[PDB]
Homo-oligomer: A and B are copies of this chain.
Amino acid sequence: MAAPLPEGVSAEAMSSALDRFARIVGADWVFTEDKITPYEDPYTISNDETEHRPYAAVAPASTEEVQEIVRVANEFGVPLWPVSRGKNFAYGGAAPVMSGTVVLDMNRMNRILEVNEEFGYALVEPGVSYFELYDYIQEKGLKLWIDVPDLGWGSVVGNALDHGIGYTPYGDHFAMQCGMEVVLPNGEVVRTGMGAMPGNNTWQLFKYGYGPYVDGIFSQSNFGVVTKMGIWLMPEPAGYRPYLITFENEDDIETVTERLRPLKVAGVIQNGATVRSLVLDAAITRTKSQYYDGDGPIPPSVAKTMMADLDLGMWNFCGALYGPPPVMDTLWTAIRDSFADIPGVKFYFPEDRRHKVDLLLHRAETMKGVPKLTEFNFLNWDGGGGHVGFSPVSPITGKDAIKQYNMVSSRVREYGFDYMGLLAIGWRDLHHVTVIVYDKTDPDERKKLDELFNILVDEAAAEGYGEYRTHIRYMDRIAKTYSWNDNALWKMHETIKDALDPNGILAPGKSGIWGKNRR
């Protein structure tokens, strides 16, 4: 039941590390036994209780405390798993790849250092939630919008660092980053970009500074602990019009994707708009048992009944227009005209929706940066479960979108799960995120889910498709798919890992990076 020590670390070295942590942060902020529960992955996959088990957690309240924790980790060989808020649900929560790792929980580092209206940026510590930043802005009356993922309880910092996405024009969270403070694995502190200039007034204004542009190496990484991050924020626009376009046929995603490509590449679709499958959208407001008594995935009659009941299609394109009315009118003509000849297509603004509790009314808040927790509802689809994200990247091409749709949905449904797919529209790509809802308390369901997930990764890789982000359980497996020139890129990451973190004390296994002591 209890976590094992990490390999190569004695009870004495662990015990000396945890006493030193308690001196740095205070005894109230070192969590070791009954108190480790929140750091376990909430959505279990393994049936092996020795896997992904944190030994303890430590909750610092300053950069100095993070530095001291990292120095102690080096002294005793005790590996850390840094998290900003640790809400990485469906990718492991706050749990580490390697059992015995100590979570470094930066929740209590929740200072909003600055929100600047005139330049549209925030400078935040890692414990700052989307709810907290949003509330600060509303309280101060600042004419800025934030960009939120579906769950507002996450970290502005942590989500961006994991290459997270939201649903406004600022939906590429890491792309909006500007300036960061990093505790390097030796416990030294650096500031990137203009933050390296003493007395600067440009840390959050100009990304590069001078010399190598290194901010990105601390994203999806174990090269450092990020303790402050700047992020650009969108000025409140002069107008906002959310829309939903629904498609009748699963096979419409091919032509729909062809039509989205020129609109997104030219920026006529201004936001990280989405195309969401029926069940993902139905599960926000309904449960399977309201339409079907069976244990399988839904049959076609059930899909069609849900579509007619909820005014949803098999595919649901949710986007928004932003700016002065004459600009929004022009963009709407180009978007509407692109879809208007597909048989079965329907166009909605919010005023056109029948239900008070409705997909479009919900996503209208998301696409103006309003944090919420409504998306958690899809976990009740089959009575209450966990989820995991299978998140391959696609070109914005109909051939690829319908290929991935067919490959993923056929397998998910074969293993007894409904298909719940998001196509998140990036600058030149789709993130295809399949959320697989399963009973995480049931060892037989966990076994099927694990087998299915390995199949989806292998079949996607055999088609030249890689994941952008993954669960702690599969980080090695995904690294091994990026194998060009005999794993050349991971050999370079391991070179950088050994130089910055020779003792391998930061997040062993994050993104399949281990360091020389554990390779």
Question: What are the interface flags for A187-211 relative to B under an 8 Å C-beta threshold, 1 for contact and 0 otherwise?
Answer: 0111110111111111011111111
Cβ of A495 and Cβ of B488 under 8 Å apart? no
Cβ of B395 and Cβ of A119 under 8 Å apart? yes
Cβ of B119 and Cβ of A396 under 8 Å apart? yes
Copies of the protein in its oligomer: 2
Cβ of B194 and Cβ of A393 under 8 Å apart? yes
Question: What are the interface flags for A202-232 relative to B under an 8 Å C-beta threshold, 1 for contact and 0 otherwise?
Answer: 1011111111111111111101000000001
**A466 and B197 in contact, given A118-B261, A211-B493 (Cβ under 8 angstroms):** yes
Determine whether A262 belongs to the interface, using a CB cutoff of 8 Å to chain B: yes
CB distance from A335 to the nearest CB of B (A): 13
Cβ of A511 and Cβ of B220 under 8 Å apart? no
- Stretch of A15-23, A336-344, A477-485 lying at the B interface: A477-485
Determine whether A4 belongs to the interface, using a CB cutoff of 8 Å to chain B: no
CB distance from A309 to the nearest CB of B (A): 36
Taking a contact as CB atoms closer than 8 A, the residue among B119, B207, B216 that contacts A214 in the complex is B216
Cβ of A219 and Cβ of B212 under 8 Å apart? yes
Whole-angstrom CA separation of A342 from B208 in the bound complex: 34
Cβ of A428 and Cβ of B178 under 8 Å apart? yes
Cβ of A190 and Cβ of B513 under 8 Å apart? no
Cβ of A261 and Cβ of B428 under 8 Å apart? no
Determine whether A89 belongs to the interface, using a CB cutoff of 8 Å to chain B: no
Which residues of the partner chain B approach A202 to less than 8 Å between Cβ atoms? 393-395, 429, 465-466
Whole-angstrom CA separation of A213 from B201 in the bound complex: 26
**A265 and B118 in contact, given A206-B426, A209-B466 (Cβ under 8 angstroms):** yes
Question: What are the interface flags for A37-78 relative to B under an 8 Å C-beta threshold, 1 for contact and 0 otherwise?
Answer: 000000000000000000000000000000000000000000
CB distance from A339 to the nearest CB of B (A): 18
Cβ of A210 and Cβ of B429 under 8 Å apart? no
CB distance from A227 to the nearest CB of B (A): 13
Cβ of B201 and Cβ of A400 under 8 Å apart? yes
Whole-angstrom CA separation of A141 from B182 in the bound complex: 47
Cβ of B428 and Cβ of A208 under 8 Å apart? no
- Stretch of A100-108, A122-130, A323-331, A361-369 lying at the B interface: A323-331
Determine whether A464 belongs to the interface, using a CB cutoff of 8 Å to chain B: yes
Which residues of the partner chain B approach A192 to less than 8 Å between Cβ atoms? 489
Determine whether A235 belongs to the interface, using a CB cutoff of 8 Å to chain B: yes
Whole-angstrom CA separation of A429 from B194 in the bound complex: 11
Determine whether A372 belongs to the interface, using a CB cutoff of 8 Å to chain B: no
Determine whether A467 belongs to the interface, using a CB cutoff of 8 Å to chain B: yes
Question: What are the interface flags for A482-519 relative to B under an 8 Å C-beta threshold, 1 for contact and 0 otherwise?
Answer: 11110011111101101110000000000111000000
Determine whether A453 belongs to the interface, using a CB cutoff of 8 Å to chain B: no
